Amino acid sequence: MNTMLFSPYTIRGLTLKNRIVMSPMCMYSCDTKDGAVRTWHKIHYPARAVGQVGLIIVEATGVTPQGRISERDLGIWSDDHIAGLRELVGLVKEHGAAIGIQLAHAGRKSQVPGEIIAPSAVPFDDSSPTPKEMTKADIEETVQAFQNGARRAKEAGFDVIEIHAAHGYLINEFLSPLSNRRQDEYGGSPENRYRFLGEVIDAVREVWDGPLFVRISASDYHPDGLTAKDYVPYAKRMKEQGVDLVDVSSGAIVPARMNVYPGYQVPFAELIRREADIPTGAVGLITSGWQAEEILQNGRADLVFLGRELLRNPYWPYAAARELGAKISAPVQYERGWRF
Amino acid sequence: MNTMLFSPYTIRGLTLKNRIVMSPMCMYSCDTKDGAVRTWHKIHYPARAVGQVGLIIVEATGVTPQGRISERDLGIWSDDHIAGLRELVGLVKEHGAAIGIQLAHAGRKSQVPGEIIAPSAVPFDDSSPTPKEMTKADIEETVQAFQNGARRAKEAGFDVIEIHAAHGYLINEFLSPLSNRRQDEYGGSPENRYRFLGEVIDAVREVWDGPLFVRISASDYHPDGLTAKDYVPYAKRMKEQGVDLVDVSSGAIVPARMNVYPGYQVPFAELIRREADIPTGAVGLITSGWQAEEILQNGRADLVFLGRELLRNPYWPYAAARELGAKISAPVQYERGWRF
Amino acid sequence: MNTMLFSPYTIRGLTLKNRIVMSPMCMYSCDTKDGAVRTWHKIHYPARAVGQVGLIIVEATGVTPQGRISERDLGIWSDDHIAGLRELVGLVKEHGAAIGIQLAHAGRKSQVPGEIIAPSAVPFDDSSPTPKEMTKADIEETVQAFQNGARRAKEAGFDVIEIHAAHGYLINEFLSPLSNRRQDEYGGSPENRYRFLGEVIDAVREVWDGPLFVRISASDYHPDGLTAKDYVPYAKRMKEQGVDLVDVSSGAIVPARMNVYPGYQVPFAELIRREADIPTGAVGLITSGWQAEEILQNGRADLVFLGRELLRNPYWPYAAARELGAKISAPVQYERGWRF
Amino acid sequence: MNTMLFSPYTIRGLTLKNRIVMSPMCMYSCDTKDGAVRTWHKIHYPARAVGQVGLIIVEATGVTPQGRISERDLGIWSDDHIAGLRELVGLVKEHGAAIGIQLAHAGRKSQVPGEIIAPSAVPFDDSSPTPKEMTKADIEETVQAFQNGARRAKEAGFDVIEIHAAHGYLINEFLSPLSNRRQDEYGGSPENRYRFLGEVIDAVREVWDGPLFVRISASDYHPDGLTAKDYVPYAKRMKEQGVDLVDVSSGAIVPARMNVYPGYQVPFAELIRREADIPTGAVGLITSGWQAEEILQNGRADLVFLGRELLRNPYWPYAAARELGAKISAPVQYERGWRF
Numbered sequence A, B, C, D: 001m002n003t004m005l006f007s008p009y010t011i012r013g014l015t016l017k018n019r020i021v022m023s024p025m026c027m028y029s030c031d032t033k034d035g036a037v038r039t040w041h042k043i044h045y046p047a048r049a050v051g052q053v054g055l056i057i058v059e060a061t062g063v064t065p066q067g068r069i070s071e072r073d074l075g076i077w078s079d080d081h082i083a084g085l086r087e088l089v090g091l092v093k094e095h096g097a098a099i100g101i102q103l104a105h106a107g108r109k110s111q112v113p114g115e116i117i118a119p120s121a122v123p124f125d126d127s128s129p130t131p132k133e134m135t136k137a138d139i140e141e142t143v144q145a146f147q148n149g150a151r152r153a154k155e156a157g158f159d160v161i162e163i164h165a166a167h168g169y170l171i172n173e174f175l176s177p178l179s180n181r182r183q184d185e186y187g188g189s190p191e192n193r194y195r196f197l198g199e200v201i202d203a204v205r206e207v208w209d210g211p212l213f214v215r216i217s218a219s220d221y222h223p224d225g226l227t228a229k230d231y232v233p234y235a236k237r238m239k240e241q242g243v244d245l246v247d248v249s250s251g252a253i254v255p256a257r258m259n260v261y262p263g264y265q266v267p268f269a270e271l272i273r274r275e276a277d278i279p280t281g282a283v284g285l286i287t288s289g290w291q292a293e294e295i296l297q298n299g300r301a302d303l304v305f306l307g308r309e310l311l312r313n314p315y316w317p318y319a320a321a322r323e324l325g326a327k328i329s330a331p332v333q334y335e336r337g338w339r340f
């Protein structure tokens, strides 16, 4: 049974052995609170690589200390992070899986003690601290921080880099009018609201020419917020800037009610894919190979991102292969076990 | 867990208790070869009604003897067929399931001994008898047969009627230029090739004002045949004539290779749905409630047609309800067994 | 994958195509309240035959009106019941499934309005009417009713007969000292409490030489009641009298707490099987083919009785066959659907 | 839903959080060929600990170099192995799982280049090297090797120790007449054939008073070989010697045909359990919580050992808990994922 799910996919120079991607998920397991890779990560990620996941994307990694979501996040603001990250990379690549990292900045949604920054001094909600309005210098510092991150990620041996522009974090906050009330050239206009992201992408492409992903929130789920069609122009923009694939998520810019169901974000992925003629990754309640195969075969997305499902079963690819009657390469150690 | 799969759907004033539809499937179980409903059908269909299927479409029923696919098909060319059909109707509606029937004519794909008819004297393949080219009288005679069938179906107490215009059968043969080489008013142009279907729809609507489906073959899978885009104008046409929902299938006008996979015909259904602005039914390798829910929630179709799965498990709705964590009314006899 | 679950089993000369048995389950669907077979039964049972169940035991059928559990039960106290039962027999055997019937008498647990009878004038609980203490004439009259029932069952064309001596009903009430306080030849000792059952078996065998099952309640779940060990001598007794297989259930002689779990009654079945050297049927939360195969291969039982599972899925045998990678004959109509 | 599967079990002073045990499975992943713990093991085992397995038993670890099955086996013949083992122990215990190790000696089935030892100079088969007949000194050396192993295992922080007396390896070879043709006090008699094992157990108990398991092969599957009843006396013996639980497997003493099916070795486990009044572990095609729960509830074994299933899904406990409606403690990191 020849399937698309387990067919190779080539981005730039990198060739993934299948279409299965481990969606970036924070583990909050940096007990040392210095952003260092810990034992938990060294067991957590390689498990999925053994599980035959084609691409494993490391959780949101703060490019600055105040850029972290929490004090237990992975970091990459120092050359000291390279060693631990390099070790992690080796542990993953070892099993035939490609490894990526999600460069992130939590913006006004950072729960790190102290000052937090954002496009405008507007709180996420009435329970969150008011962020500092970023100055011009702040913006350029942060852009430089992202570039430094990409540099270290490449240094560590990462195959793919993703820019976290979603889930209501810093970049997302520049994108949405809900959070961006600036009146300089970084706000008050679709083009202006895109500027920050545009700079981040340029800065990264300046030190990184390998696969580049950008994760977006296709919708704010708010009458005065962004919708999928607002991200078509942005996607075409990202394509022009050398972005290889758009990881299409949604929401979290502000507290909002969201109807959730199997593949509730797939239409966002197909929309961007077809309207902007750019590869996309589908994420959101993808739990079966049957479902993943339909997503791929019907051209709704090129890569399938799994979140919670890969937390429940690190070897999901095996079960999916069984479900689809496909055959994959089991680790020699598990040959007799993965066998029918 | 509030789901769309197990939400009611009203069509023309008929309320289906859910979105699950039993796709019309030939049983070839008329041992008497007279098109009469037999014990098999009386056990086969009601079983799915007990299974809590919302709508059960009875297999292809020949409006004329030579219109049957085989001599073991159900027939409706005689008022004598009513009694048996009415009994079947009661057996099904008894459990809260709506019942439909598929009015059919095999055309050049008929395997019943004797003369077979078609738009043009062109055989389906080198293993099929060459059909007689239909005269005007033949065409009007067949249109009348479709009306007689609808009339009898109404008297039997059917809730829904579907016109079989797909799978390369008679009507499909008029629609496709691959099989229709006529140079009169019934061929040579889009509206001419549609004429036969249009007349059938009108003839039926003259005696039937209930929910009316039309099953189409969205693609001929042939370079010189029809594709989805060809059926958008047709679907709009059908909407104007009072067609309530398009049951979107594909293929079988000529021998052709099909790439089959989960939901391989869903895009056809959504295409027609959104471009023709008409309710559609998705069919083709729909096997899980998870999959079915995605199709509905994402507006790809309004009803989900199940074929093979409903032959494997007549109580599929129960399994799907469990899968989705939905709650449905079990038959009072099975309450202690269906108890989650 | 050669399995024991889907291996034939011959009992007295009757060959069952597999080891799957539909456990007798009351449907309370005799709306006419005359014990007549109704449309429900004619759809309910044959569905499992199409499902490829090897043996289908019809629900508890009252040998006398007051012997019914409720007025909506099947009856067999009249020659008028034969016609309907014979029709049901044909509907089932039509698909290669053997059909059995459970001859029953509710005793003090009868809920039909009027006088109810029992070994002693002791109510099931404080919510049940106190039974009339049976006279010798009553006992012989009831034994004759069981024979009449067997005679009619034979004429209807049944393949297997099961005597309901379990679930705290009439016969069970004679067996258990909790309900049998008689001081005549029918109580006061092990063989005396067995006497009624022994007579019923003899009466039945006088008109029936086919496969004969006896359903027992292996345990009363009461400090002063019977336990499995008490039924070993009884099972040996039954073997001597020509009983072919013991269907081993438990409980319900009085209100009692039961610890229920997968195969919670299997040990009872294996106990009887190995100590009395007699074929047994295992029943009670048997839900998977995996589980069923273990029961058979490990010699815990010879037949597997399914209850609730067969109400949830009439085609369970198909699912179980897939689970075990076994091959079974699909109904010719469903061949393309059951295709693995 | 309160289950036995996820109920604590206490051995000596150790308390397992559930009845789920990871059966010892060779990984052949010691690339350095020095028996050292490698990166593979450090990822392999902790994964199951994260998966909420209650007891994880490390693969067969050779107590001597020639005692290894292969050159890629884990070893424990040197104090140098302690460091790596201690690290492994920490990585496992970290997640609430108890960790054990299987002390092993491959005997005549060793595939290590060079001399191999056995009770008698008889080959496993015509494709295997002829083993050296062990002298008295050889036997005492090997017994001392086992004691040294236990010492180091305790030193490393292991919770449980298992002695590998099965699968036709050294100890098993002393047990079975098929392989043991000695005429000294170590052969020619059930008592004599047990002597080697008896000494090994004593030697271990001399430096270890924590939980002690012994894995046996209940049957040789050969007319002239051992059967389950031969191991009853041995089990009672092991109980007398302070053995806490008998891990009941079977076969592999010589090439033999073996009928395999769900729980094909459970009867061996129950036999030893009830006849010798000693806790046992059941292993062999246990793949579902439903099945595991029946094994526990019916007193067939006290602990459930999973092999291949735990290779296919390291987080099996989660799926089993779901299957049984039980609730367990998910790692905080996976809380949102293991959640319904």
Ligand SMILES: Cc1cc2nc3c(=O)[nH]c(=O)nc-3n(C[C@H](O)[C@H](O)[C@H](O)COP(=O)(O)O)c2cc1C
Pocket (backbone or CB within 6 Å): A023, A024, A025, A026, A027, A059, A060, A102, A164, A215, A249, A283, A284, A285, A286, A305, A306, A307, A308, A309, D333, D336, D337
């Ligand atoms: C525990 C957890 C942590 C997450 N952290 C991240 C993250 O760091 N970066 C990100 O892009 N998405 C994050 N998300 C979202 C997931 O990556 C995923 O896209 C989302 O949960 C939906 O995917 P799923 O339905 O397959 O779980 C997280 C989700 C979960 C449950």
Ligand SMILES: Cc1cc2nc3c(=O)[nH]c(=O)nc-3n(C[C@H](O)[C@H](O)[C@H](O)COP(=O)(O)O)c2cc1C
Pocket (backbone or CB within 6 Å): B023, B024, B025, B026, B027, B059, B060, B102, B164, B167, B215, B249, B283, B284, B285, B286, B305, B306, B307, B308, B309, C333, C336, C337
């Ligand atoms: C045995 C069988 C008979 C069928 N007969 C008909 C038919 O009479 N009319 C029709 O429109 N489709 C017929 N089909 C196609 C089914 O309606 C259904 O669309 C097709 O099998 C694919 O759906 P599925 O993947 O859910 O099985 C038949 C299919 C099968 C397997």
Ligand SMILES: Cc1cc2nc3c(=O)[nH]c(=O)nc-3n(C[C@H](O)[C@H](O)[C@H](O)COP(=O)(O)O)c2cc1C
Pocket (backbone or CB within 6 Å): B333, B336, B337, C023, C024, C025, C026, C027, C059, C060, C102, C164, C167, C215, C249, C283, C284, C285, C286, C305, C306, C307, C308, C309
């Ligand atoms: C609705 C229902 C009706 C039943 N009626 C009978 C009956 O008439 N005779 C009988 O022996 N057992 C009867 N039982 C018990 C079943 O035969 C079966 O042994 C029990 O439900 C447990 O089996 P299971 O776990 O496979 O469902 C009935 C059970 C149910 C759920």
Ligand SMILES: Cc1cc2nc3c(=O)[nH]c(=O)nc-3n(C[C@H](O)[C@H](O)[C@H](O)COP(=O)(O)O)c2cc1C
Pocket (backbone or CB within 6 Å): A333, A336, A337, D023, D024, D025, D026, D027, D059, D060, D102, D164, D215, D249, D283, D284, D285, D286, D305, D306, D307, D308, D309
């Ligand atoms: C790859 C593999 C390695 C094994 N190595 C060992 C071992 O080192 N020690 C042992 O006692 N059993 C070993 N066995 C047997 C397993 O521990 C297990 O008891 C057997 O495979 C049956 O269990 P299962 O059906 O759950 O897989 C091994 C089995 C497999 C498949």
